[PDB]
Ligand binder design. Structure first.
Ligand SMILES: O=c1ccn([C@@H]2O[C@H](COP(=O)(O)OP(=O)(O)O[C@H]3O[C@H](CO)[C@@H](O)[C@H](O)[C@H]3F)[C@@H](O)[C@H]2O)c(=O)[nH]1
Length: 392
C-alpha cells in the first residue's frame, strides 16, 4: 500500500486526497491519515482515511478547544500521530506527507522504522527550503527542535529509533516535491533538485446541487465569491454582494470556513457550502477569491477571469501571478470597499480578459498525480502500479 498523511486546512488536504484517489485508480491500496474535518471528503471519493487529532476548522472544535497547530498542544499532537499512524502504515511501501511539521516528523519517524521511502510535498514555491536563506533554515530547525524535539525523541525511543535533530530538515526532507502547476508557479531555472510534479487535482465528478443548478439556469452567469478555509475581510459579504450587483451580475457566495451569509432576501444571490469548483467555475462570469494555491489553480484551469483579494501568507504571490498572467486583477489590499471591488470586477469582466483566461486555462496540466505515482513506483522499486502506468 501507500500511506498519505497531512495536517492542515483544505488546501493542504485536497492535493493529498487527489493523489490517494489517483493511486487507487492505478491499482495501489492508498490510504490516508488526516484531521477529522475530512471524513466526508475522503468517503465521497472512495478513499480510506483514518482521522487523527483535533479538527482544523475552529467551528468543528468545541468552544475554547485549541487548534492542532497551537504551540500549547504540540506534545499531545506528536503523541496522537505516533498512536494512530502505526495501524495505518502497516503494509505500506511508501509515504507521502504535507502540512503541520510536528505531525510530519512523527510520520517520517514511523517510515524510518519500517525502512520505507518518505516524501514531503510543498504546494507553493516560496515554501521550498531552497527558497529560504541558510539563516532562515537554521532558525526553523532550532525552533522545531526546541518546541517539540524532546516529545518527538521520546516517541522515537518508544519504537527503538535513535534521537533525531534538525526537525525542519527532517520533516521537509532535503528535497521536497513541489505539487504546483509550473505555469502558475514557475521554478527558478537554477533549481535542478526540486521535482515539480504539477498540481494534484482530483477530477471532480460530484453533481452540483439542485439549488445551484436551478440558480445557474435561471439567469445570466453569476460571479462567485469565496475565501476558502481562511478569514474573510470585514463586511466581506456586504461589500462583495453590493460590488457584484453594481456590475449588473448575480452572486454565488461561498460561506467557507468564515461562515459568510446573505445580507438580504435578494433572489439574485445564492449562498453555497461545498461545491464542485471544476464544474461551477466553467459556468461563472468571474471568481473573487483569496488566492489560495488550490483555489487559484482551479480558477485558472477553469478559465474564469479572477479578482484575487489576498489575506495572508502565499496569497499575495498568487494575486501577483494572476495579474502577471493577465487573467485577473490583483486587488490592492486585503479589505475591499464596494468601490474598489466594483472597479476590479469591471476590469475582470471585459471580453479581453475573458479570452486571456480561456487561453491560459489550456496550459494548466491536470496530470500531476500521474507524475507523482510514477515517482512513487520508482522509489518503491529501488505489479499493478507498473502495469497501470505502462498503460497510461
Ligand atoms: O467548495 C469548495 C471549496 C474548495 N474546493 C477545493 O478545495 C481546494 C482549496 O485549495 P486552497 O489551496 O485554496 O485551500 P485553502 O485551505 O482555502 O487555502 C490555504 O491553504 C493553501 C495551501 O497551503 C494556501 O495556499 C492558502 O494560503 C490557504 F489559506 C481547491 O482545490 C478547491 O477547488 C472545492 O472543490 N469546493
Amino acid at each position: 500500500g501507500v500511506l498519505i498523511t497531512g495536517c492542515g486546512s483544505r488546501g493542504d488536504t485536497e492535493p493529498l486526497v487527489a493523489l490517494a484517489a489517483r493511486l487507487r485508480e492505478l491499482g495501489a491500496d492508498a490510504r490516508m491519515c488526516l484531521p477529522p474535518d475530512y471524513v466526508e471528503r475522503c468517503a465521497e471519493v472512495g478513499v480510506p482515511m483514518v482521522p487523527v487529532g483535533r479538527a482544523v476548522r475552529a467551528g468543528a472544535r468545541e468552544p475554547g478547544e485549541l487548534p492542532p497547530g497551537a504551540a500549547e498542544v504540540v506534545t499531545e499532537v506528536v503523541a496522537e500521530w505516533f498512536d494512530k499512524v502505526p495501524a495505518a502504515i502497516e503494509g505500506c511501501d511508501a509515504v507521502v506527507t504535507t502540512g503541520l511539521l510536528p505531525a510530519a516528523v512523527a510520520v517520517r519517524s514511523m517510515a524510518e522504522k519500517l525502512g520505507i521511502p518518505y516524501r514531503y510535498t510543498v504546494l507553493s514555491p516560496d515554501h521550498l527550503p531552497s527558497e529560504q536563506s541558510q539563516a532562515e533554515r537554521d532558525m526553523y530547525n532550532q525552533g522545531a527542535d526546541r518546541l517539540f524535539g524532546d516529545a518527538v525523541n521520546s516517541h522515537r525511543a518508544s519504537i527503538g529509533l535513535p534521537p533525531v535533530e534538525h526537525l525542519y530538515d527532517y520533516g521537509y526532507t532535503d528535497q521536497p516535491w513541489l505539487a504546483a502547476d509550473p505555469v502558475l508557479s514557475p521554478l527558478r531555472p537554477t533549481d535542478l533538485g526540486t521535482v515539480q510534479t504539477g498540481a494534484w487535482i482530483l477530477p471532480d465528478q460530484r453533481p452540483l446541487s439542485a439549488e445551484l443548478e436551478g440558480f445557474l439556469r435561471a439567469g445570466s452567469p453569476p460571479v462567485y465569491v469565496g475565501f476558502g478555509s481562511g478569514p474573510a475581510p470585514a463586511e466581506a459579504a456586504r461589500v462583495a454582494i453590493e460590488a457584484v450587483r453594481a456590475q449588473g451580475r448575480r452572486v454565488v457566495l461561498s460561506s467557507g470556513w468564515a461562515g459568510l451569509g446573505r445580507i438580504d432576501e435578494g433572489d439574485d444571490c445564492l449562498v453555497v457550502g461545498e461545491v464542485n469548483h471544476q464544474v461551477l467555475f466553467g459556468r461563472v462570469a468571474a471568481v473573487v477569491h483569496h488566492g489560495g494555491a488550490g483555489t487559484t489553480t482551479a480558477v485558472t484551469r477553469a478559465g474564469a477571469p479572477q479578482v484575487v483579494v489576498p489575506q495572508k501568507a502565499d496569497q499575495p504571490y498568487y494575486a501577483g501571478r494572476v495579474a502577471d498572467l493577465g487573467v485577473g486583477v490583483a486587488h490592492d489590499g486585503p479589505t475591499p470597499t464596494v468601490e474598489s471591488l466594483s472597479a476590479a470586477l469591471a476590469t475582470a469582466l471585459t471580453p479581453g480578459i475573458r479570452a486571456r483566461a480561456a487561453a491560459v486555462a489550456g496550459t494548466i496540466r491536470t496530470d500531476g498525480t500521474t507524475v507523482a505515482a510514477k515517482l512513487l513506483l520508482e522509489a518503491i522499486s529501488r505489479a499493478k502500479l507498473a502495469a497501470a502506468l505502462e498503460h497510461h
